[PDB]
Design a binder for this molecule. Structure first.
Ligand SMILES: Cc1c[nH]c2ncc(C(=O)OCCn3ccccc3=O)cc12
Ligand SMILES: [Cl-]
Ligand SMILES: [Cl-]
Ligand SMILES: [Cl-]
Length: 163
């Protein structure tokens, strides 16, 4: 584990991360997909062998020795707010178990269900709070990746508020 476990946020492509493993915002069928998923497919295509897994779960596949944790958040266009919220919290809990099992000192993570699976809604606070709920008990350095300038500022404010 990290000597002083921390949270940080960076606004850039998660495929260029400087962490010991990456979390993919995966689809249930292990397809190349869009957004973060398509960038992860271009960088670590080997990690998509048998990566299909149900909504609310995480499945790790190695690309060489580099772990790619495929986490499947719900698509809020299909789920109700109540059941989608429950599946989103569950996907993050499974990411925390995988990060712990791997023994890594750092992990690059995107905000699950905030892109095309958001159902056209702003889910920054909802997704980030479920990320914190799951990762707070781990000792890995967590680096959150985003692409929007205003989202970078809001995630940074939320991290600093708790310190
Ligand atoms: C590739 C890229 C560049 N700039 C981006 N900015 C945003 C996204 C993206 O997926 O946004 C989803 C989350 N989000 C972010 C800001 C405002 C509303 C909202 O729902 C992708 C890119
Ligand atoms: Cl970039
Ligand atoms: Cl998404
Ligand atoms: Cl973003």
């Amino acid at each position: 584990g990290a000597m002083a476990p921390s949270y940080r946020v960076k606004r850039m492509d998660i495929a260029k991360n400087d962490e010991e493993c990456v979390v993919n915002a995966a689809n249930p069928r292990g397809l190349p997909g869009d957004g973060v998923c398509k960038a992860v497919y271009k960088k670590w295509p080997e990690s998509f062998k048998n990566s299909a897994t149900p909504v609310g779960t995480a499945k790790t596949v190695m690309c060489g020795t580099y772990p790619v944790i495929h986490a499947v958040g719900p698509n809020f266009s299909n789920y109700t707010e109540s059941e989608g919220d429950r599946e989103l919290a569950a996907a993050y809990r499974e990411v925390a178990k995988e990060v712990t099992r791997l023994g890594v000192n750092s992990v690059a993570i995107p905000l699950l269900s905030t892109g095309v699976y958001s159902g056209g809604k702003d889910r920054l606070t909802q997704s980030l709070n479920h990320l914190f709920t799951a990762m707070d008990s781990t000792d890995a350095d967590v680096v959150i990746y985003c692409r929007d300038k205003e989202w970078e500022k809001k995630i940074s404010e939320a991290i600093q508020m708790r310190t």
